[PDB]
Design an enzyme around this catalytic site. Sequence first.
Site, short mmCIF file in Angstrom:
data_model
loop_
_atom_site.label_atom_id
_atom_site.label_comp_id
_atom_site.label_asym_id
_atom_site.label_seq_id
_atom_site.Cartn_x
_atom_site.Cartn_y
_atom_site.Cartn_z
N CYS A 196 -3.74 -19.71 2.50
CA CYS A 196 -4.33 -20.76 3.33
C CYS A 196 -3.27 -21.64 4.00
O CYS A 196 -2.47 -22.28 3.34
CB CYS A 196 -5.25 -21.65 2.48
SG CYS A 196 -6.05 -22.96 3.43
N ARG A 228 -3.74 -26.11 3.80
CA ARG A 228 -3.69 -26.84 2.54
C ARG A 228 -3.18 -28.28 2.54
O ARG A 228 -3.30 -28.96 1.53
CB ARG A 228 -2.93 -26.00 1.51
CG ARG A 228 -3.76 -24.83 0.92
CD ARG A 228 -2.89 -24.04 -0.02
NE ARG A 228 -1.95 -23.17 0.69
CZ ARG A 228 -0.90 -22.59 0.13
NH1 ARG A 228 -0.64 -22.80 -1.16
NH2 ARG A 228 -0.13 -21.76 0.84
N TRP A 286 -12.47 -26.00 8.56
CA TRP A 286 -12.70 -25.89 10.01
C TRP A 286 -11.75 -24.81 10.52
O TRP A 286 -10.74 -24.49 9.87
CB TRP A 286 -12.45 -27.23 10.73
CG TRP A 286 -11.16 -27.88 10.41
CD1 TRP A 286 -9.93 -27.55 10.90
CD2 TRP A 286 -10.96 -28.99 9.53
NE1 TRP A 286 -8.97 -28.39 10.39
CE2 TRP A 286 -9.58 -29.29 9.54
CE3 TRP A 286 -11.81 -29.77 8.74
CZ2 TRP A 286 -9.02 -30.34 8.79
CZ3 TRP A 286 -11.26 -30.81 7.99
CH2 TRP A 286 -9.88 -31.09 8.03
N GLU A 340 -8.23 -17.62 14.73
CA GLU A 340 -9.13 -16.88 13.86
C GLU A 340 -10.25 -16.26 14.68
O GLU A 340 -10.64 -15.09 14.47
CB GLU A 340 -9.77 -17.80 12.80
CG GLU A 340 -8.80 -18.36 11.77
CD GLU A 340 -9.50 -19.21 10.72
OE1 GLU A 340 -10.14 -18.65 9.82
OE2 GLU A 340 -9.41 -20.46 10.80
C1 HEM Z 1 -9.78 -27.65 6.53
C2 HEM Z 1 -9.49 -26.55 7.27
C3 HEM Z 1 -8.86 -25.41 6.82
C4 HEM Z 1 -8.06 -24.70 7.63
C5 HEM Z 1 -7.60 -25.10 9.03
C6 HEM Z 1 -7.83 -23.45 6.94
C7 HEM Z 1 -7.24 -22.33 7.51
C8 HEM Z 1 -7.20 -21.02 6.94
C9 HEM Z 1 -6.85 -19.78 7.63
C10 HEM Z 1 -6.29 -19.66 9.07
C11 HEM Z 1 -6.98 -18.75 6.78
C12 HEM Z 1 -6.84 -17.27 7.08
C13 HEM Z 1 -8.26 -16.82 7.37
C14 HEM Z 1 -8.37 -15.33 7.62
O1 HEM Z 1 -7.41 -14.73 8.15
O2 HEM Z 1 -9.43 -14.77 7.28
C15 HEM Z 1 -7.36 -19.34 5.54
C16 HEM Z 1 -7.49 -18.63 4.37
C17 HEM Z 1 -7.87 -19.15 3.12
N1 HEM Z 1 -8.19 -20.46 2.87
FE1 HEM Z 1 -8.10 -22.04 4.19
N2 HEM Z 1 -8.41 -23.44 5.68
C18 HEM Z 1 -9.07 -24.61 5.60
C19 HEM Z 1 -9.88 -24.92 4.50
C20 HEM Z 1 -10.07 -24.18 3.31
C21 HEM Z 1 -10.73 -24.71 2.15
C22 HEM Z 1 -11.46 -26.04 2.10
C23 HEM Z 1 -10.50 -23.79 1.14
C24 HEM Z 1 -11.06 -23.75 -0.15
C25 HEM Z 1 -11.48 -24.86 -0.80
C26 HEM Z 1 -9.64 -22.77 1.68
C27 HEM Z 1 -9.28 -21.57 1.00
C28 HEM Z 1 -8.65 -20.48 1.56
C29 HEM Z 1 -8.50 -19.18 0.92
C30 HEM Z 1 -8.85 -18.82 -0.55
C31 HEM Z 1 -8.01 -18.36 1.92
C32 HEM Z 1 -7.78 -16.86 1.87
C33 HEM Z 1 -9.15 -16.19 1.85
C34 HEM Z 1 -9.05 -14.68 1.86
O3 HEM Z 1 -8.23 -14.14 1.10
O4 HEM Z 1 -9.80 -14.04 2.64
N3 HEM Z 1 -9.38 -23.02 2.99
N4 HEM Z 1 -7.54 -20.73 5.67
N1 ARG Z 2 -10.43 -21.86 8.58
C1 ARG Z 2 -11.05 -21.24 7.59
N2 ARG Z 2 -11.44 -21.95 6.54
N3 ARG Z 2 -11.28 -19.93 7.66
C2 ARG Z 2 -11.96 -19.12 6.63
C3 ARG Z 2 -12.09 -17.64 7.01
C4 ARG Z 2 -12.85 -17.48 8.34
C5 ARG Z 2 -12.59 -16.14 9.07
N4 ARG Z 2 -11.13 -15.95 9.30
C6 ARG Z 2 -13.33 -16.12 10.43
O1 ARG Z 2 -12.67 -16.03 11.48
O2 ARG Z 2 -14.58 -16.18 10.43
#
Ligand code: HEM
Ligand code: ARG
Lengths: 411, 407
Positions: free
Chosen positions: B106, B109, B278, B283
């Site tokens: 992520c 974070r 968000w 993405e």
């Molecule tokens: C607030 C905005 C947030 C942003 C901008 C953000 C952004 C991202 C992005 C760009 C990815 C890659 C997504 C993909 O390629 O499918 C990601 C993955 C991830 N995020 Fe965040 N995230 C946010 C919030 C969250 C929250 C609130 C959680 C959990 C409480 C979280 C947990 C994770 C996890 C576990 C992954 C990897 C998921 C997987 O393996 O498919 N994210 N996030």
């Molecule tokens: N910013 C995030 N929390 N992304 C969570 C995964 C969403 C996914 N990569 C999509 O394009 O639908």
Amino acid sequence: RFLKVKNWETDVVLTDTLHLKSTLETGCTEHICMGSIMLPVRTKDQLFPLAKEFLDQYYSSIKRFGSKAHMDRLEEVNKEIESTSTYQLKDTELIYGAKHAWRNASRCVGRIQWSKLQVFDARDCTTAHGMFNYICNHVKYATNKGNLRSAITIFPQRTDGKHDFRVWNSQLIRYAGYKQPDGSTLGDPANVQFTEICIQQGWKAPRGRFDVLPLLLQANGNDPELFQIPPELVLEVPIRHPKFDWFKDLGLKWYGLPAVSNMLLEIGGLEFSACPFSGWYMGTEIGVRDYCDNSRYNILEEVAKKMDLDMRKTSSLWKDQALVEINIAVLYSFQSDKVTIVDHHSATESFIKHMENEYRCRGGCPADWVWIVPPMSGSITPVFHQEMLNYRLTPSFEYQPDPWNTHVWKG
Amino acid sequence: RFLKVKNWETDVVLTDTLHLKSTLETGCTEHICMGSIMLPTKDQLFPLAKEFLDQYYSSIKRFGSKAHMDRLEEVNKEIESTSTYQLKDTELIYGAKHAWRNASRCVGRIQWSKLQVFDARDCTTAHGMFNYICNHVKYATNKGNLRSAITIFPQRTDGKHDFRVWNSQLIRYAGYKQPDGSTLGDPANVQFTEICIQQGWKAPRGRFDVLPLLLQANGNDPELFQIPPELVLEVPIRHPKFDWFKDLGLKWYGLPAVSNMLLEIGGLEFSACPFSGWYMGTEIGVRDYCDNSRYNILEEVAKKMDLDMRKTSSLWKDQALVEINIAVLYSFQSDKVTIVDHHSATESFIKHMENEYRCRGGCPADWVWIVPPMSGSITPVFHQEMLNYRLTPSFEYQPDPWNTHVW
Ligand code: HEM
Ligand SMILES: NC(=[NH2+])NCCC[C@H](N)C(=O)O
Ligand code: HEM
Ligand SMILES: C[C@H](O)[C@H](O)[C@H]1CNc2nc(N)[nH]c(=O)c2N1
Ligand SMILES: C[C@H](O)[C@H](O)[C@H]1CNc2nc(N)[nH]c(=O)c2N1
Ligand SMILES: NC(=[NH2+])NCCC[C@H](N)C(=O)O
Ligand SMILES: [Zn+2]
């Protein structure tokens, strides 16, 4: 223990058995992945085994494993090693060795061409002037008036570590970098340190933004000597854009031959510390990294201005828009001048085919995803979607410390 | 032991000690790196709870206090007794926040501590789950000013009484396989889109049909529910220069809400823990819109832009890619729906890494996922060495329910 890799775009799955022959370490553990870390005198005792593994692979490759010729060679090398603490490779073995180090280079996306490597044997070289001559011939042969040919020149191997042959340049052709008293940098910032050494050695710097550096060559552990590559031998391409006439006015240009010259080639335990090699460029190397890295020529802003892009907020993706244009210009200019070059789409598609072939015919293809995926448009290239296994096979190309850090100056 | 990571663009060097607290495996070995592979008992339980409680109390400056020892003893007794235990609310919230803190893939974070946690452990039915999810969606959407949140359903017991959200994301577009052989809508969801139908859903067979929730409670079979449309915020995609862009008929939802993962806290497994934040522009614009196996829209856009699609070297795909992503960010912004561009997001992550290194001794990060799918090297994370390792509490992948459910 078989291992499978999947391509999430085509669902194609491949099985890797080749990793089993991997001996060297990766830097990773079961507890930590160092996949994105840039950089994670032998004894008779350790030499023969390395030699045997190599000769075994070599003889198998020519379908003569276990033959009398194979056995006699092992015996001969064994005796020679015990007799002289080292050994000399046959010409055939050297060529096979060099080609396989390229075949085994996990960070190289251009490996589909590995078997066509032209190998120049410079093991009879004894002086820097001799090195200069071999190097000039390599550049002329490889440049081939724009129709580039991959090549490698191999200077004498390491003996006691006190008589090393080294090419102090990081690439045979590269532009000088000069730190100005006002803190800015003129030319290529990546070569500032080396440029200072050259000046200190006696080079009269023209101090422009694209001065081809001189060669600083070290033969047999002696102090390095300066040599200017004949300008007529250095092919350069003026960079212009197919639609923007002002682009040419940025005064940009680059050289056509990319020739890494600071790596170490290991073959059957032997270490070749001076083994300059060349291929041809993938556009993004110049367009994305050399021109747009903040630490390189850093031209994104100036290019974005000329395009009158909204640079008020990053979300306008002005950086991304300018990057594409600059990369369009690099490919266009090279193609117009008929200098070999490959775009990232084409190069990555080829690597995928090469990779599949390797799995099928060799049982695998060590690949470093971090390096293989292009620095722009990552996911629109097939490699992004391709799972890869990275592991170290020999023969191999390895990093070595800059010689100015280890050299014992004689005066 | 003490590892260092260097940023090649700023020469900044950080030392990582946090990895020394790693507990799970990476998939890698001294002989092989699998960094790009997408998916590499009471006796078992107490140590896990202990590890967790220790970090929890250490975090609240009461390490080795009576409260600490006490709680440790209480959980201990409860485990030996019930074969499991229940987290206090304070522990649940800390666990969830840290699970996000530890998600190495992520890039968002820096926002980890602001997570709103909805405790749905008292839930017992699919309708109940639907209600909790509707509340989550409305709370998190907040009229476009998105707020991160996670709703935590009951933890696993015997494995035959698991709560599971079958959707992969709370909100996603349906995918249908047409006679043409081609695919209508989102190909990634062709299958799930079928299981809904295999359940009764009346698919409007459109390009962007919001899917129905398929909820599984306490182990029973899953049920369908249509999310109130007024609760699904969507953004019509237009370009700030190409009026023909709107014609493309593109739109996307504003709330990204991964719903198929498993949250592990102190050995306890929460199999239904949907969470949302968000979007980062790429993405949608790069992956969802331009992946070949997704909406695959580059050709059409290139066409409309009238680009020389004869040679790959004209980089028409790249030019189009840029314009598209410009349009996603422009739309969302124009509709006041929270969204972040990859440049701003990566800059934030670098800052977060620094904060994490000095205040915690490190930050597990997966380079392969952190670097955006476009313009990689012009974002700072590309030049940043990262160390990937698994810390718990964590979010883990888990089998798609329809491949384990015993109807
Ligand atoms: C607030 C905005 C947030 C942003 C901008 C953000 C952004 C991202 C992005 C760009 C990815 C890659 C997504 C993909 O390629 O499918 C990601 C993955 C991830 N995020 Fe965040 N995230 C946010 C919030 C969250 C929250 C609130 C959680 C959990 C409480 C979280 C947990 C994770 C996890 C576990 C992954 C990897 C998921 C997987 O393996 O498919 N994210 N996030
Ligand atoms: N910013 C995030 N929390 N992304 C969570 C995964 C969403 C996914 N990569 C999509 O394009 O639908
Ligand atoms: C035929 C043209 C070739 C192409 C198009 C190609 C392409 C590339 C590219 C794009 C990279 C990454 C470079 C960087 O980011 O700095 C690379 C790396 C590499 N290539 Fe190739 N290559 C070619 C020929 C060769 C040859 C002839 C050799 C060796 C005999 C070779 C050895 C390597 C090695 C060892 C690396 C990693 C270098 C490092 O770690 O800095 N390549 N190549
Ligand atoms: C820190 C990170 O490993 C570093 O910036 C890498 C990433 N991928 C790369 N890939 C290629 N081809 N060349 C490079 O120099 C790099 N640099
Ligand atoms: C095969 C490879 O691991 C795969 O395509 C990865 C690469 N990097 C990624 N990075 C992010 N953020 N999301 C992804 O889905 C992927 N897919
Ligand atoms: N395609 C190659 N052979 N590349 C060798 C490395 C050249 C280096 N990346 C440069 O931009 O100058
Ligand atoms: Zn690894």
